[PDB]
C-alpha cells in the first residue's frame, strides 16, 4: 500500500473514467494542466445559450447587500482529492455574502434548480467596539462598522471578511466562528477588495490607504506591503500565478504586480474626446477605474465610471480595445423636478438639452478564469454577457439578462456537470445603494437580494 | 512571518552548483540567522543543509529587508 501505489490506483481509476466518457484521452489530459500555461483554453462563448437562461431573484433581509463570494470544490489532479474541507462536504457549493448591516451569511447553491438556502450566519454590532483606540489593539472578534468585502478560501476551510473597521477577520466555514483577527494597523487602512490566489492560501487585500497587503491564511501572518497607486485601490484580482492586478480609482491607472520580481507594470487609459470626436469626423471622460478582473495571465479587463469596458494586454500600455458607454446613458432628470418655474418651456431649458446626461458606471465586472466570456454589472437593470474574440483583440455583446434590478455590487460564476456538458450559474449581489457609498439616486424597483441565473451549453 | 525570494538564478555545472540572489523580507524582526536561511533554502531546493551556503548579507536602511 505504498503512496506511489495509491496515486497509481487513483490515476488508473481516473483514466478508466475518461475512457468511459470517450486522441480524446490525450487531448483532455493536456487540458487538465492548461491552467499552468497562462493562456485562454475555455472557448465556450458561442456554446452559451443566454436567451434560455433560467433567471430568479431571491430577497434578503440585510439592507444593502455589499458583496458575495462563491466557493466551488475542484478535483485536484496532483492528488485526485476534492478541495472540499471534510467528508460531509463532498460536491457542495457554498456562497457567502456580507452586508452593511454587519452580518455575514453563508448559503448553499449546490442545487441549480433551487434557490440559495441559508445555513448559518454571524452578525456584529456595537458590542465589539474597541475601547483601547490604538490600531494594534483593534483585535475584537466581531465587526462594528460596514463590512465591504468577503472571499472564500480555495481550500474551503476559511472565509475572510473585511470592512471600514480596519480589520481582517477570518472565519471558520463550518461554524462561522472567528478564529483570528488581523488589524491592518493604519488609521485609514480600510479594506476595499479581497482576492485569493487561485488554488492557494495567499490573500491579497486592497486598502484605502493606497496600499495592497498580502497574507498567508494558513500561517495567519502578514507577508508584504505593496506601494505605488496614486489614489485608493478600489478593486483587486488574482489568478493561478502571483500576478495580482489592481485599479487605483480616480488616479485612472491599473497596475499589475509581479510579487516575485518585485516590479509593477503601469497601465493608463489616456483617452480624450476631442480626438475621438475628430476621429468620427456623446463621449464622456473617464473619472475612475473601479473594477478589474483578469481574463488571463497576460490579459485583464477594467470598468470605469464613464461606462468604458477596456481590454488590456501586458505588452501594451494603452488599451487594445475599448467599449464606450457599455451600459448606456442614465435617464434624464424630470422637467417637473429640474426647476420650480411654472411654465413648462422654462423648465425644459434648465435640462440644457443633452449636456446633463451621464453614463452608467460599471459597478461590477467578472471574467471566468481562462475563458473568453466575462460579465459586466451596473444598475441599468440587466447583466450583460460579453465574448472576447478568438485573437483576443476585441469583444462583442453575447447577450443580456434582465432579471437583476438595482446596483450590482459583485458578480460570481459557478459551474457543474461533466467536462463536455456544463451548466453555469451566475450569482450577483444586488443592493439599493452602491457598496462604497450612498451617492447613487435610488433606483425604482431596486431590492436587496441575490440575483441568480442558470445558463446551459448546447451544440 | 518572513519570506525568502530567490532571483537571478544561474546554474553553474562547472563548479556543480546553483548561484542566486537571496532577498529576505522580515517585517518586525532584526534579521535571519544564516543557519535558518540555510535550512529554508535547503528544503525549498530539495538539497541537504550542508550543501547550502549564504553570504554577503546587508540589511536595507530602515529595516524590513
Amino acid at each position: 500500500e505504498n503512496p506511489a501505489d495509491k496515486r497509481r490506483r487513483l490515476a488508473k481509476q481516473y483514466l478508466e473514467n475518461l475512457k468511459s466518457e470517450a486522441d480524446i484521452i490525450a487531448s483532455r489530459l493536456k487540458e487538465d494542466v492548461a491552467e499552468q500555461q497562462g493562456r485562454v483554453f475555455r472557448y465556450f462563448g458561442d456554446k452559451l445559450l443566454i436567451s434560455e437562461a433560467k433567471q430568479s431573484f431571491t430577497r434578503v433581509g440585510e439592507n444593502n447587500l455589499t458583496c458575495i463570494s462563491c466557493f466551488q470544490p475542484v478535483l485536484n489532479k496532483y492528488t485526485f482529492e476534492e478541495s472540499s474541507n471534510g467528508d460531509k462536504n463532498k460536491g457542495r457549493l457554498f456562497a457567502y455574502t456580507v452586508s452593511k448591516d454587519l452580518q455575514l451569511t453563508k448559503y448553499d447553491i449546490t442545487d441549480f434548480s433551487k434557490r440559495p438556502k441559508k445555513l448559518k450566519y454571524a452578525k456584529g454590532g456595537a458590542k465589539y467596539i474597541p475601547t483601547s483606540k490604538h490600531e494594534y489593539e483593534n483585535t475584537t472578534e466581531g465587526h462594528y462598522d460596514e463590512i465591504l468585502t468577503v472571499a472564500a478560501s480555495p481550500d474551503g476551510k476559511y472565509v475572510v471578511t473585511g470592512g471600514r473597521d480596519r480589520k481582517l477577520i477570518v472565519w471558520s466555514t463550518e461554524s462561522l466562528s472567528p478564529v483570528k483577527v488581523i488589524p491592518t494597523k493604519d488609521r485609514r487602512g480600510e479594506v476595499l477588495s479581497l482576492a485569493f490566489r487561485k488554488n492557494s492560501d495567499q490573500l491579497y487585500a486592497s486598502c484605502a490607504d493606497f496600499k495592497i497587503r498580502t497574507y498567508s491564511i494558513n500561517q495567519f501572518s502578514q507577508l508584504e506591503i505593496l506601494y505605488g497607486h496614486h489614489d485608493i485601490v478600489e478593486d483587486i484580482s488574482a489568478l493561478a500565478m502571483e500576478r495580482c492586478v489592481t485599479v487605483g480609482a480616480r488616479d485612472r491607472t491599473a497596475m499589475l504586480w509581479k510579487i516575485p520580481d518585485e516590479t509593477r507594470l503601469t497601465f493608463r487609459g489616456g483617452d480624450e474626446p476631442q480626438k475621438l470626436l475628430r476621429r468620427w469626423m456623446l463621449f464622456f471622460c473617464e473619472g475612475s477605474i473601479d473594477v478589474v478582473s483578469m481574463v488571463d495571465d497576460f490579459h485583464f479587463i477594467t470598468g470605469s465610471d464613464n461606462g468604458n469596458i477596456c481590454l488590456w494586454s501586458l505588452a501594451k500600455k494603452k488599451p487594445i480595445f475599448t467599449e464606450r458607454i457599455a451600459h448606456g446613458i442614465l435617464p434624464e432628470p424630470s422637467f417637473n423636478d429640474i426647476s420650480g418655474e411654472t411654465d413648462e418651456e422654462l423648465r425644459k431649458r434648465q435640462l440644457q438639452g443633452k449636456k446633463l446626461l451621464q453614463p452608467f458606471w460599471i459597478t461590477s465586472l467578472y471574467a471566468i478564469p481562462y475563458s473568453n466570456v466575462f460579465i459586466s454589472g451596473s444598475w441599468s437593470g440587466s447583466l450583460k454577457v460579453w465574448k472576447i474574440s478568438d485573437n483576443l483583440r476585441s469583444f462583442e455583446l453575447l447577450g443580456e439578462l434582465s432579471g437583476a434590478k438595482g446596483v450590482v455590487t459583485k458578480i460570481q460564476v459557478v459551474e457543474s456537470g461533466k467536462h463536455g456538458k456544463e451548466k453555469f450559474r451566475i450569482l450577483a449581489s444586488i443592493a439599493k445603494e452602491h457598496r462604497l457609498g450612498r451617492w447613487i439616486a435610488n433606483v425604482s424597483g431596486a431590492r436587496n437580494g441575490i440575483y441568480s441565473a442558470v445558463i446551459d451549453q448546447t451544440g | 512571518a518572513v519570506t525568502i525570494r530567490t532571483r537571478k538564478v544561474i546554474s553553474n555545472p562547472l563548479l556543480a552548483r546553483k548561484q542566486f540572489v537571496v532577498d529576505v523580507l522580515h517585517p518586525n524582526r532584526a534579521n535571519v540567522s544564516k543557519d535558518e536561511l540555510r535550512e529554508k533554502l535547503a528544503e525549498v531546493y530539495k538539497a541537504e543543509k550542508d550543501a547550502v551556503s549564504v553570504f554577503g548579507f546587508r540589511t536595507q536602511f530602515g529595516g524590513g529587508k
Binding site: 498567508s216 500561517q219 501572518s221 507577508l223 502571483e242 516575485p260 | 512571518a1 518572513v2 519570506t3 525568502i4 525570494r5 530567490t6 532571483r7 537571478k8 538564478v9 542566486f20 529554508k40 525549498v44 531546493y45
Partner: peptide, 8 residues
C-alpha cells in the same frame, strides 16, 4: 526563475 517560501 526562483522559488518562494514563508515561515513562522
Amino acid at each position: 526563475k526562483g522559488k518562494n517560501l514563508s515561515f513562522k
